[PDB]
Amino acid sequence: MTGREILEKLERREFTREVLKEALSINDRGFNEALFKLADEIRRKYVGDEVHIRAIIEFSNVCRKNCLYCGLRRDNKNLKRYRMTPEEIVERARLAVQFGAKTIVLQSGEDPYXMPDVISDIVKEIKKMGVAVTLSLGEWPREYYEKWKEAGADRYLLRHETANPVLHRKLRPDTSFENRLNCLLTLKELGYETGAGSMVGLPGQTIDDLVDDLLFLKEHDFDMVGIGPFIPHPDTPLANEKKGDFTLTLKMVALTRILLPDSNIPATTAMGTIVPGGREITLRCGANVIMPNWTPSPYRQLYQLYPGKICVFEKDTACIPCVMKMIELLGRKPGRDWGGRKRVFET
């Protein structure tokens, strides 16, 4: 199919493997710009001009897993490990709510210390503030997920990483794609708004793999989808591999919006790390969420999944104001409510 024909099929919602493969394979500037415009327009029509702010607190960099891409992997001895106290986390969340955050995201390595009861206690305290709570804590027993839902958690982010089971197992040697999917299905069954997503440009990953990621996301109809480029970290086995391509990653975000028009899709910090102004571009190519860093010093600089974190030198309270300025200069509006998914049922 020609570029024009692929665009027409996307507009008619003929989302075949063949159409998706061709969209990711064509490198023509004209085609790409038309794809981005289509995603931007679909975003505006379905989810409007509000950009939802999710304040993220990265509360522990301790991890029991050994994912090959991740700077927090357990084999990395070149890292000072930290744990925020429950009181520090709650009060940091309170400060974010004081600054206008309507969702608090708690993210960590897979750190056994907190699990499950300390998390439950923290979630309960933050829910009293009248905001949404999102957890992003990795893979845990169903019972832990159940306890956290009962404690009042609203959403769970668990990127599927890669839908190729062979590549998944190689990159995530403690676990499997089967496990990851089972966790995502459990989260959905328990009533969480559930987020998946993937990295683009992983070593060994192919275009067909990216197509499979898109089809996987469409199959399971996730509420949120987080996508970013792979960025090699020097203290990992993938230190010498190539970074993911920004434009290809942007096309994945655009296609995700086209496939899942009413989903919540962040402009991830990795997009802003690989290219100056990358988040702002992504917000104009299908994304409608932004996640300003709210991890305080001295811990922020110790939570580097990949190097070059854009907020690392900024003050503790800088990032919420910074994204509000961003939203205004983009001609957009901040979210007025918790920014939960607003499903538009269609055919």
Ligand X SMILES: C[C@H](CCC(=O)NCCC[N+](C)(C)CCCS(=O)(=O)[O-])[C@H]1CC[C@H]2[C@@H]3[C@H](O)C[C@@H]4C[C@H](O)CC[C@]4(C)[C@H]3C[C@H](O)[C@]12C
Residues that bind ligand X (CB under 6 A): 29, 32-33, 36-37, 40, 98-100, 246-247, 250, 275, 281, 284-285, 320-321, 324-325, 328, 334
Say which residues have a Cβ less than 8 Å from residue 156's Cβ, sequence separation at least 6. Answer: 134, 135, 136, 145, 148, 187, 192, 193, 194, 195
Q: If binding is defined by CB under 6 A, does position 58 make contact with ligand SF4?
A: no
Q: What is the spatial distance between Cα 121 and Cα 127, in angstroms, rounded to a whole number?
A: 10
Q: Which is nearer to ligand 5AD, 228 or 292 (CB)?
A: 228
Known binding residues for [2Fe-2S] cluster are 311, 319, 322
Minimum gap (Å) between residue 193 Cβ and ligand SF4? 20
Partner whose footprint covers residue 296, from ligand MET, ligand SF4, ligand 5AD, none (CB < 5 to 8 Å by kind): none
Helix (H) / strand (E) element for 82: namely none
Q: If binding is defined by CB under 6 A, does position 158 make contact with ligand SF4?
A: no
Nearest to 189 by CA among 149, 245, 228, 229: 149
From residue 59, how far is each of 133, 188, 193, 272, 301 by CA, in Å? 14, 24, 21, 22, 12
Which residues in 200-229 contact Cl ion (CB under 5 A)? Answer: 226, 228
Q: Which is nearer to ligand X, 18 or 33 (CB)?
A: 33
Partner whose footprint covers residue 80, from ligand 5AD, ligand X, Cl ion, none (CB < 5 to 8 Å by kind): none
Q: If binding is defined by CB under 5 A, does position 244 make contact with Cl ion?
A: no
Question: Where on the chain is the footprint of ligand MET (CB under 6 A)?
Answer: 72, 107, 109-110, 136, 138, 158, 305
CB atoms within 10 A of CB 130: 9
What is the total count of residues that contact ligand SF4 (CB under 6 A)?
9
Residue pair 195/266 in contact by the 8 Å Cβ criterion: no
Minimum gap (Å) between residue 245 Cβ and ligand X? 9
Helix (H) / strand (E) element for 307: namely none
Question: Where on the chain is the footprint of ligand 5AD (CB under 6 A)?
Answer: 69-70, 159, 161, 199, 228, 230-231, 233, 270, 305-306
Minimum gap (Å) between residue 136 Cβ and ligand 5AD? 7
Stretch of 13-21, 27-35, 98-106, 162-170 lying at the interface with Cl ion (CB under 5 A)? 98-106
User: Which DSSP category does 291 fall into?
Assistant: -
Torsion-angle region of 216 (φ positive above 0: left; ψ -120 to 50: alpha; else: beta): alpha
- Collapsing DSSP to helix, strand or coil, 199 comes out as strand
The binder of ligand SF4 chosen from 10, 20, 70, 199 (CB under 6 A): 70
Known binding residues are 63, 67, 70, 311, 319, 322
Three-state secondary structure string covering 231-257: CCCCCCCCCCCCCCCHHHHHHHHHHHH
Which residues in 53-72 contact Cl ion (CB under 5 A)? Answer: 54
Residue pair 302/80 in contact by the 8 Å Cβ criterion: yes
Nearest to 197 by CA among 168, 219, 232, 228: 228
Dihedral of alpha carbons 64, 66, 70, 74, sign: positive
Stretch of 35-43, 148-156, 253-261, 315-323 lying at the interface with Cl ion (CB under 5 A)? 148-156
Minimum gap (Å) between residue 142 Cβ and ligand SF4? 18
Q: What is the spatial distance between Cα 103 and Cα 153, in angstroms, rounded to a whole number?
A: 11
Q: If binding is defined by CB under 6 A, does position 73 make contact with ligand SF4?
A: yes
Minimum gap (Å) between residue 46 Cβ and ligand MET? 27
Known binding residues for [4Fe-4S] cluster are 63, 67, 70
Residue pair 152/192 in contact by the 8 Å Cβ criterion: no
Partner whose footprint covers residue 169, from ligand SF4, Cl ion, ligand 5AD, none (CB < 5 to 8 Å by kind): none
